[PDB]
Design a protein around this ligand. Structure first.
Ligand SMILES: OC[C@H]1O[C@@H](O[C@@H]2[C@@H](O)[C@H](O[C@@H]3[C@@H](O)[C@H](O[C@@H]4[C@@H](O)[C@H](O[C@@H]5[C@@H](O)[C@H](O)O[C@H](CO)[C@H]5O)O[C@H](CO)[C@H]4O)O[C@H](CO)[C@H]3O)O[C@H](CO)[C@H]2O)[C@H](O)[C@@H](O)[C@@H]1O
Ligand SMILES: OC[C@H]1O[C@@H](O[C@@H]2[C@@H](O)[C@H](O[C@@H]3[C@@H](O)[C@H](O[C@@H]4[C@@H](O)[C@H](O[C@@H]5[C@@H](O)[C@H](O)O[C@H](CO)[C@H]5O)O[C@H](CO)[C@H]4O)O[C@H](CO)[C@H]3O)O[C@H](CO)[C@H]2O)[C@H](O)[C@@H](O)[C@@H]1O
Length: 436
């Protein structure tokens, strides 16, 4: 049963309970374990392990959260027990689609079949749950003025995730973006993610402006609120909880759910449940695998308990694209033109027909240098600054390398099955001889 968590839907720039019509405000906390290699996932999926989630849910209930943010799940594992247990306590999940080893690389961005398949797998693993609030298609990808060209790749991912969900049988779970709070890029990022023909469904900010005993005015929350007034999609703090002063009083929570902010913001999620020697936890897991409550826990509990956002109902709420920011060198370099939807079938042709391949089974960046000095690699280049994307730029890194390897082989024309790269991961594809 999911009775206690009816699906949340979006209308304009607010979330609503699809059954009651009441505005939904997030009172959340980030919930993600980390390991302190070839045999286990690099990330830990607490939602795949009942003994973990069932341990923590009583404590989450005590905090008074209705939402968790989870950054990584393993789509090969079941999640129904933990998701059902969360639902039974009125709790929803915001979930990143990426994981540390499969994400858009902010410094060398690509939007390709490998990352897209990761996104689809998470969508197919998690979309049956009514308490799946939303998916993030990226987290802090562009994070300063030096990597703004990564943002078109994120927007393509938003487009493609939304279309994959739309064409599937699943409930249309919204797909949004989570950003940091760099003063130089934050305005352009917010506009970019709602400009042109592709838009984020919602927008979360990792918000650390309020440290210690700050105020609505001095913290910055007042100005942030003024600037998001009328922003066309729901906006919330995907993280908050600056730890400069401890124990964190979390007085920002009083502001966030107060009358002035509640008209603009859809709430927020504290960062985070687990203590990881980074002093951001509200609990610490002991050597006995038990939960030790930390000094922050009671302050967050008290502040959420007191939080009573006055919203508006769906019915009362109910009663021309935005221009993309202009390009300026060193300042804003995210082209409006987006990479194409990765095409698994086109890219799989490379696996079948290419004479020379590199298996997925330091090397890569060096092998590109070498190959791309001998053949023209334009067809695998992706440029988010100029909006120019090569024909095979959506294929996996290994497919892109294999294409260049095979072009070099054909250019040489020895036709002797010696792939022109002496390396254990290189092989001559025998299927290439079979007569996309
Ligand atoms: O320099 C050349 C070498 O570059 C390497 O590539 C680097 C590349 O791997 C790296 O990718 C970034 C991802 O790792 C990153 O993944 C995100 C996680 O960081 C995030 O963690 C969250 C954290 O943000 C929050 O504060 O706490 C959470 C709870 O603890 C924690 O989970 O989770 C996200 C969701 O799972 C996850 O996506 O994502 C970035 C943005 O998309 C990626 O950029 O990027 C580096 C550049 O910044 C690259 O250097 C190559 O692999 C090597 O071959 C090269 O030698
Ligand atoms: O470093 C990697 C992590 O980067 C994050 O993104 C960064 C982003 O969060 C950051 O935002 C700026 C805020 O930090 C800044 O906040 C200011 C407060 O820190 C300050 O606290 C005062 C304190 O200075 C004083 O000493 O004592 C006071 C009493 O205790 C205390 O309140 O208050 C200021 C207001 O008076 C407040 O401004 O505000 C800036 C302007 O809004 C924010 O931009 O900016 C960084 C770049 O500059 C970002 O890199 C990511 O989210 C993390 O995931 C990364 O790990």
């Amino acid at each position: 049963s999911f009775e206690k968590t009816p699906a949340i839907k979006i209308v304009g720039n607010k979330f609503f309970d699809s059954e009651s019509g009441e505005q939904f405000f997030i009172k959340g906390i980030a919930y993600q374990l980390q390991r302190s290699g070839a045999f286990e996932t690099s990330y830990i999926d607490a939602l795949a392990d009942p003994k973990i989630c069932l341990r923590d849910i009583p404590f989450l209930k005590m905090l008074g959260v209705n939402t968790l943010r989870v950054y990584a799940i393993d789509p090969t594992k079941s999640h129904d027990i933990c998701m059902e247990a969360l639902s039974a306590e009125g709790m929803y999940v915001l979930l990143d689609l990426s994981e540390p080893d499969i994400s858009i690389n902010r410094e060398n961005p690509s939007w390709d079949v490998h990352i897209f398949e990761r996104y689809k797998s998470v969508i197919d693993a998690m979309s049956s749950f009514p308490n799946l609030l939303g998916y993030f298609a990226g987290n802090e990808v562009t994070n300063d003025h030096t990597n703004t060209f990564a943002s078109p790749f994120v927007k393509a991912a938003i487009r493609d995730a939304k279309e994959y969900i739309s064409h599937s049988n699943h409930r249309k779970i919204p797909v949004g973006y989570s950003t940091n709070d760099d003063a130089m890029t934050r305005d352009n990022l917010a506009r970019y993610f709602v400009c042109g023909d592709v838009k984020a469904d919602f927008y979360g900010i990792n918000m650390y402006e309020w440290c210690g005993y700050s105020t609505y005015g001095t913290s910055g929350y007042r100005e942030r609120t003024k600037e998001f007034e009328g922003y066309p999609i729901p906006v919330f703090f995907s993280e908050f909880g600056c730890n400069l002063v401890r124990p964190r009083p979390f007085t920002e929570v009083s502001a966030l759910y107060g009358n002035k902010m509640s008209s603009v913001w859809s709430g927020g999620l504290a960062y985070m449940y687990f203590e990881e020697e980074n002093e951001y936890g509200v609990v610490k897991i002991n050597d006995n695998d038990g939960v030790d409550i930390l000094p922050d826990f009671k302050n967050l509990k008290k502040e959420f308990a007191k939080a009573d956002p006055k919203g508006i109902t769906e019915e009362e709420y109910l009663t021309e694209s935005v221009e993309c920011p202009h390009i300026a060198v060193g300042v804003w370099e995210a082209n409006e033109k987006l990479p194409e939807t990765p095409d698994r079938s086109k890219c799989a042709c490379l696996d079948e027909i290419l004479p020379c391949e590199i298996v997925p089974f330091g090397k890569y960046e060096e092998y590109f240098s070498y190959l791309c000095s001998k053949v023209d690699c334009s067809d695998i280049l992706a440029n988010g600054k100029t909006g120019e994307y090569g024909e095979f730029s959506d294929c996996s890194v290994e497919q892109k390398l294999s294409l260049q390897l095979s072009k070099l082989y054909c250019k040489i024309g020895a036709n002797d099955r010696h792939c022109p790269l002496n390396d254990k991961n290189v092989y001559f594809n025998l299927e290439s001889l079979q007569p996309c």
